[PDB]
mmCIF file of all heavy atoms in Angstrom:
data_model
loop_
_atom_site.group_PDB
_atom_site.id
_atom_site.type_symbol
_atom_site.label_atom_id
_atom_site.label_comp_id
_atom_site.label_asym_id
_atom_site.label_seq_id
_atom_site.Cartn_x
_atom_site.Cartn_y
_atom_site.Cartn_z
ATOM 1 N N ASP C 457 10.511 -16.374 31.057
ATOM 2 C CA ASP C 457 10.179 -16.042 32.441
ATOM 3 C C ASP C 457 9.325 -14.757 32.464
ATOM 4 O O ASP C 457 9.372 -13.859 31.702
ATOM 5 C CB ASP C 457 11.468 -15.753 33.215
ATOM 6 C CG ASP C 457 12.339 -17.016 33.316
ATOM 7 O OD1 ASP C 457 11.859 -18.152 33.095
ATOM 8 O OD2 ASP C 457 13.551 -16.835 33.696
ATOM 9 N N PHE C 461 4.813 -13.286 42.070
ATOM 10 C CA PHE C 461 4.569 -12.714 43.351
ATOM 11 C C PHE C 461 5.125 -13.621 44.330
ATOM 12 O O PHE C 461 4.567 -14.749 44.701
ATOM 13 C CB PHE C 461 3.105 -12.506 43.555
ATOM 14 C CG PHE C 461 2.867 -11.556 44.687
ATOM 15 C CD1 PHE C 461 3.084 -10.173 44.532
ATOM 16 C CD2 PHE C 461 2.288 -12.007 45.960
ATOM 17 C CE1 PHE C 461 2.851 -9.366 45.622
ATOM 18 C CE2 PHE C 461 2.025 -11.089 46.943
ATOM 19 C CZ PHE C 461 2.258 -9.701 46.830
ATOM 20 N N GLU C 468 8.818 -16.922 62.578
ATOM 21 C CA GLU C 468 8.884 -16.470 63.974
ATOM 22 C C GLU C 468 7.630 -15.769 64.348
ATOM 23 O O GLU C 468 7.035 -16.042 65.399
ATOM 24 C CB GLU C 468 10.150 -15.568 64.039
ATOM 25 C CG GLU C 468 10.223 -14.942 65.409
ATOM 26 C CD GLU C 468 11.651 -14.422 65.653
ATOM 27 O OE1 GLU C 468 12.275 -14.098 64.703
ATOM 28 O OE2 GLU C 468 12.010 -14.220 66.859
ATOM 29 N N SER C 536 -0.719 -9.594 56.361
ATOM 30 C CA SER C 536 0.231 -8.622 56.367
ATOM 31 C C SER C 536 1.041 -8.666 57.735
ATOM 32 O O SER C 536 2.227 -8.167 57.654
ATOM 33 C CB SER C 536 -0.251 -7.179 56.293
ATOM 34 O OG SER C 536 -1.176 -6.949 57.241
ATOM 35 N N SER C 539 3.748 -11.848 56.873
ATOM 36 C CA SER C 539 4.217 -12.021 55.506
ATOM 37 C C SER C 539 4.834 -10.857 55.027
ATOM 38 O O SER C 539 4.758 -9.692 55.386
ATOM 39 C CB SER C 539 3.149 -12.536 54.643
ATOM 40 O OG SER C 539 2.265 -11.484 54.339
ATOM 41 N N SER C 540 5.759 -11.005 53.977
ATOM 42 C CA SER C 540 6.320 -9.984 53.120
ATOM 43 C C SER C 540 6.519 -10.498 51.743
ATOM 44 O O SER C 540 6.496 -11.695 51.547
ATOM 45 C CB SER C 540 7.755 -9.654 53.761
ATOM 46 O OG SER C 540 8.645 -10.821 53.741
ATOM 47 N N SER C 541 6.466 -9.530 50.814
ATOM 48 C CA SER C 541 6.390 -9.939 49.440
ATOM 49 C C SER C 541 7.304 -9.050 48.483
ATOM 50 O O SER C 541 7.521 -7.916 48.879
ATOM 51 C CB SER C 541 4.872 -9.868 48.912
ATOM 52 O OG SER C 541 4.334 -8.752 49.188
ATOM 53 N N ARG C 542 7.711 -9.551 47.446
ATOM 54 C CA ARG C 542 8.471 -8.853 46.468
ATOM 55 C C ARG C 542 8.206 -9.435 45.088
ATOM 56 O O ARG C 542 7.692 -10.514 44.885
ATOM 57 C CB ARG C 542 9.931 -8.881 46.831
ATOM 58 C CG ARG C 542 10.451 -10.368 46.736
ATOM 59 C CD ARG C 542 12.036 -10.380 46.954
ATOM 60 N NE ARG C 542 12.573 -11.732 46.837
ATOM 61 C CZ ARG C 542 12.482 -12.722 47.718
ATOM 62 N NH1 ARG C 542 11.949 -12.446 48.920
ATOM 63 N NH2 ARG C 542 13.002 -13.971 47.400
ATOM 64 N N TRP C 543 8.485 -8.702 44.047
ATOM 65 C CA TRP C 543 8.367 -9.053 42.639
ATOM 66 C C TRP C 543 9.696 -9.781 42.300
ATOM 67 O O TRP C 543 10.717 -9.406 42.635
ATOM 68 C CB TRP C 543 8.106 -7.978 41.665
ATOM 69 C CG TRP C 543 6.768 -7.350 41.857
ATOM 70 C CD1 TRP C 543 6.425 -6.097 42.330
ATOM 71 C CD2 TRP C 543 5.454 -8.110 41.455
ATOM 72 N NE1 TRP C 543 5.054 -6.021 42.233
ATOM 73 C CE2 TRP C 543 4.443 -7.050 41.877
ATOM 74 C CE3 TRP C 543 5.134 -9.286 40.989
ATOM 75 C CZ2 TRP C 543 3.105 -7.428 41.585
ATOM 76 C CZ3 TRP C 543 3.889 -9.667 40.822
ATOM 77 C CH2 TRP C 543 2.860 -8.694 41.104
ATOM 78 N N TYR C 545 11.250 -12.843 38.840
ATOM 79 C CA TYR C 545 10.967 -13.617 37.666
ATOM 80 C C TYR C 545 11.067 -15.098 37.891
ATOM 81 O O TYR C 545 11.951 -15.594 38.625
ATOM 82 C CB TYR C 545 11.965 -13.143 36.648
ATOM 83 C CG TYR C 545 11.400 -11.882 35.812
ATOM 84 C CD1 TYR C 545 11.462 -10.604 36.288
ATOM 85 C CD2 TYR C 545 10.865 -12.154 34.462
ATOM 86 C CE1 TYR C 545 10.884 -9.551 35.556
ATOM 87 C CE2 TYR C 545 10.291 -11.007 33.869
ATOM 88 C CZ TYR C 545 10.457 -9.698 34.321
ATOM 89 O OH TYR C 545 9.912 -8.674 33.641
ATOM 90 N N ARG D 39 15.594 -5.709 29.418
ATOM 91 C CA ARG D 39 15.548 -7.027 30.041
ATOM 92 C C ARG D 39 16.327 -8.018 29.276
ATOM 93 O O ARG D 39 16.990 -8.936 29.901
ATOM 94 C CB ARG D 39 14.131 -7.447 30.139
ATOM 95 C CG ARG D 39 13.898 -8.767 30.782
ATOM 96 C CD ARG D 39 13.399 -9.788 29.675
ATOM 97 N NE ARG D 39 13.247 -11.136 30.265
ATOM 98 C CZ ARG D 39 11.964 -11.665 30.445
ATOM 99 N NH1 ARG D 39 10.871 -10.978 30.096
ATOM 100 N NH2 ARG D 39 11.849 -12.937 30.931
ATOM 101 N N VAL D 62 3.932 -4.361 36.789
ATOM 102 C CA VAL D 62 4.447 -4.460 38.112
ATOM 103 C C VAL D 62 5.226 -3.242 38.543
ATOM 104 O O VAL D 62 5.690 -3.161 39.788
ATOM 105 C CB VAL D 62 5.252 -5.729 38.385
ATOM 106 C CG1 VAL D 62 4.351 -7.002 38.242
ATOM 107 C CG2 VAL D 62 6.424 -5.799 37.355
ATOM 108 N N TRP D 64 7.977 -1.958 37.069
ATOM 109 C CA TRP D 64 9.466 -2.028 36.859
ATOM 110 C C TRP D 64 9.800 -1.125 35.646
ATOM 111 O O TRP D 64 9.305 -1.406 34.580
ATOM 112 C CB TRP D 64 9.831 -3.520 36.583
ATOM 113 C CG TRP D 64 9.987 -4.337 37.824
ATOM 114 C CD1 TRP D 64 9.408 -4.164 39.080
ATOM 115 C CD2 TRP D 64 10.819 -5.437 37.962
ATOM 116 N NE1 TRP D 64 9.787 -5.087 39.983
ATOM 117 C CE2 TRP D 64 10.760 -5.926 39.374
ATOM 118 C CE3 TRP D 64 11.778 -6.220 37.212
ATOM 119 C CZ2 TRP D 64 11.418 -7.079 39.819
ATOM 120 C CZ3 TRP D 64 12.466 -7.186 37.696
ATOM 121 C CH2 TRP D 64 12.309 -7.660 39.022
ATOM 122 N N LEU D 69 14.713 -3.719 35.305
ATOM 123 C CA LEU D 69 15.103 -4.890 34.617
ATOM 124 C C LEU D 69 16.534 -5.112 34.366
ATOM 125 O O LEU D 69 17.093 -6.242 34.531
ATOM 126 C CB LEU D 69 14.273 -4.879 33.277
ATOM 127 C CG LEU D 69 12.782 -5.030 33.391
ATOM 128 C CD1 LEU D 69 12.046 -4.366 32.258
ATOM 129 C CD2 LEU D 69 12.345 -6.509 33.545
ATOM 130 N N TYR D 72 18.163 -6.182 37.493
ATOM 131 C CA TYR D 72 17.768 -7.520 37.944
ATOM 132 C C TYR D 72 18.570 -8.553 37.119
ATOM 133 O O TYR D 72 19.128 -9.529 37.713
ATOM 134 C CB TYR D 72 16.281 -7.701 37.769
ATOM 135 C CG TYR D 72 15.778 -9.051 38.166
ATOM 136 C CD1 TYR D 72 15.274 -9.218 39.438
ATOM 137 C CD2 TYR D 72 15.719 -10.139 37.278
ATOM 138 C CE1 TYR D 72 14.824 -10.521 39.806
ATOM 139 C CE2 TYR D 72 15.200 -11.353 37.658
ATOM 140 C CZ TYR D 72 14.731 -11.473 38.933
ATOM 141 O OH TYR D 72 14.271 -12.768 39.319
ATOM 142 N N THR D 94 5.542 -1.492 42.320
ATOM 143 C CA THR D 94 4.320 -1.443 43.010
ATOM 144 C C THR D 94 4.483 -1.916 44.450
ATOM 145 O O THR D 94 3.545 -1.698 45.252
ATOM 146 C CB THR D 94 3.252 -2.174 42.299
ATOM 147 O OG1 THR D 94 3.687 -3.544 42.163
ATOM 148 C CG2 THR D 94 2.902 -1.574 40.950
ATOM 149 N N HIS D 105 20.339 -7.608 45.776
ATOM 150 C CA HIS D 105 19.844 -9.042 46.201
ATOM 151 C C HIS D 105 20.447 -10.089 45.327
ATOM 152 O O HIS D 105 20.657 -11.152 45.822
ATOM 153 C CB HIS D 105 18.327 -8.966 45.982
ATOM 154 C CG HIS D 105 17.702 -10.110 46.772
ATOM 155 N ND1 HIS D 105 16.394 -10.523 46.324
ATOM 156 C CD2 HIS D 105 17.973 -10.780 47.732
ATOM 157 C CE1 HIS D 105 15.982 -11.523 47.076
ATOM 158 N NE2 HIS D 105 16.963 -11.784 47.969
ATOM 159 N N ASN D 128 7.758 -3.678 52.899
ATOM 160 C CA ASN D 128 7.989 -4.503 54.002
ATOM 161 C C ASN D 128 9.060 -3.990 54.967
ATOM 162 O O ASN D 128 9.476 -4.680 55.942
ATOM 163 C CB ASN D 128 8.373 -5.892 53.626
ATOM 164 C CG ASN D 128 7.566 -6.499 52.374
ATOM 165 O OD1 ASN D 128 6.468 -6.676 52.406
ATOM 166 N ND2 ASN D 128 8.392 -6.509 51.254
ATOM 167 N N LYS D 160 10.084 -4.721 58.904
ATOM 168 C CA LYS D 160 8.775 -4.813 59.534
ATOM 169 C C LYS D 160 8.762 -5.743 60.724
ATOM 170 O O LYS D 160 7.970 -5.607 61.702
ATOM 171 C CB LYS D 160 7.618 -5.110 58.541
ATOM 172 C CG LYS D 160 7.761 -6.483 57.972
ATOM 173 C CD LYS D 160 6.702 -6.748 56.910
ATOM 174 C CE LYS D 160 5.380 -6.766 57.544
ATOM 175 N NZ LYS D 160 4.287 -7.150 56.609
ATOM 176 N N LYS D 163 13.978 -6.887 62.239
ATOM 177 C CA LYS D 163 15.177 -7.529 61.931
ATOM 178 C C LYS D 163 16.204 -6.659 61.320
ATOM 179 O O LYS D 163 15.921 -5.859 60.432
ATOM 180 C CB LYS D 163 15.019 -8.825 61.157
ATOM 181 C CG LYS D 163 14.045 -9.719 61.680
ATOM 182 C CD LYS D 163 14.574 -10.458 62.985
ATOM 183 C CE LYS D 163 13.498 -11.447 63.510
ATOM 184 N NZ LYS D 163 13.988 -12.128 64.688
#
Side-chain angles (χ1 to χ4, degrees):
Chain C
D457 294 347
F461 197 73
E468 177 164 24
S536 60
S539 68
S540 58
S541 53
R542 63 176 186 278
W543 290 113
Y545 270 76
Chain D
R39 176 254 182 107
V62 292
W64 279 29
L69 292 152
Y72 183 92
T94 56
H105 198 204
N128 326 288
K160 61 183 299 188
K163 304 298 180 172

